[PDB]
Amino acid sequence: HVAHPSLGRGDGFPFLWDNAASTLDQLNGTDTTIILNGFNYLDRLSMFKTVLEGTRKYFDSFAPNNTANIYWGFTIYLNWILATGRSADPTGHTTCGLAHGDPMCLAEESWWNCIKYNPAAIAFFAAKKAGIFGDVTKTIVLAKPKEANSPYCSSEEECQAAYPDVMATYLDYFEYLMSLEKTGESIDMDKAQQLLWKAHVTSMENSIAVCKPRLKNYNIIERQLDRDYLISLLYFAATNFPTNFIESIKFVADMPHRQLRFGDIAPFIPDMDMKKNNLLVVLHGFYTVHSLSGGSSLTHWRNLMESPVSREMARDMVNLILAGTPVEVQVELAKLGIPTPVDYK
Ligand SMILES: *[C@@H]1O[C@H](CO)[C@@H](O)[C@H](O)[C@H]1NC(C)=O
């Protein structure tokens, strides 16, 4: 049995979904503690699953199997990074994540691991704080990184001190949910999604500089995909596109099913379908606009995205992208009010 990049265990749910904890009580620990290994796939899966189960009651009415839940996004992406080998050690110094080593191990040296750690772990703490799992007396004990002054925080307090904006934004999301018990209001989806994206973006923006050196562990083609993906995410986030199960599967199904290498030129990669080849072109399109505008296109984009009408029009562009419809990013952005930059070097 191996994790499928888009289908997880086979029907979209993550590889080993049933094996992950639904509640804190199913985790390992000692009567006074909870043990979680942040460098293990299953424990990282449980950091997502427990929040998903914990928040299921707010989304249950809308779709079967907690699929309307907007926590799915980075949960589905956990499976994709596993399945494509992107959580493994790219340096050759350990066998962490490799088939002949510990396949569940997530490497410190992995760029994907580096950027996705906080949305699993810090978010978990924030849910704990907000009361999503209930009263928790036991202390959470996280496995420590081997690197000195590592980007990976290993306790609630250390996480909070290292990345205070990331903790505060995920807290705001979970507090908003809890508040729905305190008032009986039905959830405002647009608002819940906007809060969750704000935390996601704050995390990315908090980890871009610290994780950046890990990009050199990959060949130039895979490395530019990483960059293209992170910059693109910031544009997608501003549209408030849903991060539920259906949309997250759609996304991963368009992402490359293996690490890129020298010789891969999108949209002409012959072991990939049209949707994967197109998306790679699109992600690089966002990168190019961003880069040639010196980042100023993202400031303009976020200003324009203060309008709900614009966000809706921008989501229609994202849907076109995910279906594989060829779009030139610069042309679509211009249409939505973004000055097209040109190369001045
Ligand atoms: C929930 O998921 C399982 C496995 O994917 C499936 O067999 C079942 O039909 C789903 N339940 C509903 C209510 O759709």
CA distance 247 to 240: 12
Contact 47, 36 (CB under 8 A): yes
Strand boundaries in 114-268, DSSP class E: 139-142
Pull the structure tokens for residue 218: 């990959």
- What one-character DSSP code corresponds to residue 110? -
CA torsion, ordered 223, 225, 229, 232, to nearest 10 deg: 120
Where in the sequence is the domain holding 82, given as residue range(s)? Answer: 1-345
Give 105's strand partners.
40
- What one-character DSSP code corresponds to residue 247? H
- C-alpha of residue 10 to centroid of ligand 1, in Å: 12
Q: Which stretch of DSSP H or E encloses residue 107?
A: none
Report which protein residue has its CA nearest ligand 1's atom 14: 64
Q: Which stretch of DSSP H or E encloses residue 124?
A: helix 111-130
CA distance 35 to 125: 13
Report which protein residue has its CA nearest ligand 1's atom 1: 65
50 three-state secondary structure: helix
Strand boundaries in 93-154, DSSP class E: 139-142
Q: Which stretch of DSSP H or E encloses residue 222?
A: helix 220-238
Experimentally, how was this structure solved? X-ray
Report which protein residue has its CA nearest ligand 1's atom 10: 65
What totals of helices (H) and strands (E) does the chain contain, helices first? 12, 2
Q: How far is CA 296 from the centre of its chain?
A: 24
CA distance 158 to 106: 20
Give start and end residues of each alpha helix (H) in 239-307. Answer: 245-253, 274-292, 296-304
Q: 290-310 burial string, b = 16+ CB within 10 Å, else e?
A: bbbbeeebbeebeebbeeeeb
Rounded to 5°, the CA angle 91-96-101 comes to 120
- What one-character DSSP code corresponds to residue 151? S
Give 35's strand partners.
28, 141
| Omega prior to 308 cis, within 30 of 0 | no
Please give the number of the atom of ligand 1 that sits closest to the Cα of 12: 5
- C-alpha of residue 246 to centroid of ligand 1, in Å: 14
Please give the number of the atom of ligand 1 that sits closest to the Cα of 11: 5
Q: Ligand 1: does its nearest atom lie under 6 Å from the Cβ of 64?
A: yes
| C-alpha Rg value of the chain to the nearest Å | 20
**Amino acid letter, residue 212:** K
How many residues are present in the chain? 345
Q: Ligand 1: does its nearest atom lie under 6 Å from the Cβ of 181?
A: no
Strand boundaries in 5-112, DSSP class E: 33-36
Strand boundaries in the chain, DSSP class E: 33-36, 139-142
Report which protein residue has its CA nearest ligand 1's atom 5: 11
Q: Ligand 1: does its nearest atom lie under 6 Å from the Cβ of 11?
A: yes
CA distance 286 to 233: 9
How many domains are contained in the chain?
1
- Mention every residue, 6+ apart, whose C-beta is less than 8 A from residue 201: 233, 234, 237
Report which protein residue has its CA nearest ligand 1's atom 3: 65
Contact 134, 53 (CB under 8 A): no
Rounded to 5°, the CA angle 49-51-52 comes to 60
Phi, psi angle pair for 324, to nearest 5° = 90, 10
SS percent in the chain: helix, strand, coil, step 5: 55, 5, 40
Report which protein residue has its CA nearest ligand 1's atom 2: 65
CA distance 103 to 271: 24
Q: How far apart are the first and last CA of the chain?
A: 50
199 three-state secondary structure: helix
Give 33's strand partners.
139
Nearest to 73 by CA among 251, 316, 236, 278: 251
- What one-character DSSP code corresponds to residue 65? G
Q: Ligand 1: does its nearest atom lie under 6 Å from the Cβ of 65?
A: yes
Q: At what angle do helices 111-130 and 189-211 cross, to 10 degrees?
A: 140
Widest pairwise Cα distance in the chain: 63
Contact 104, 92 (CB under 8 A): no
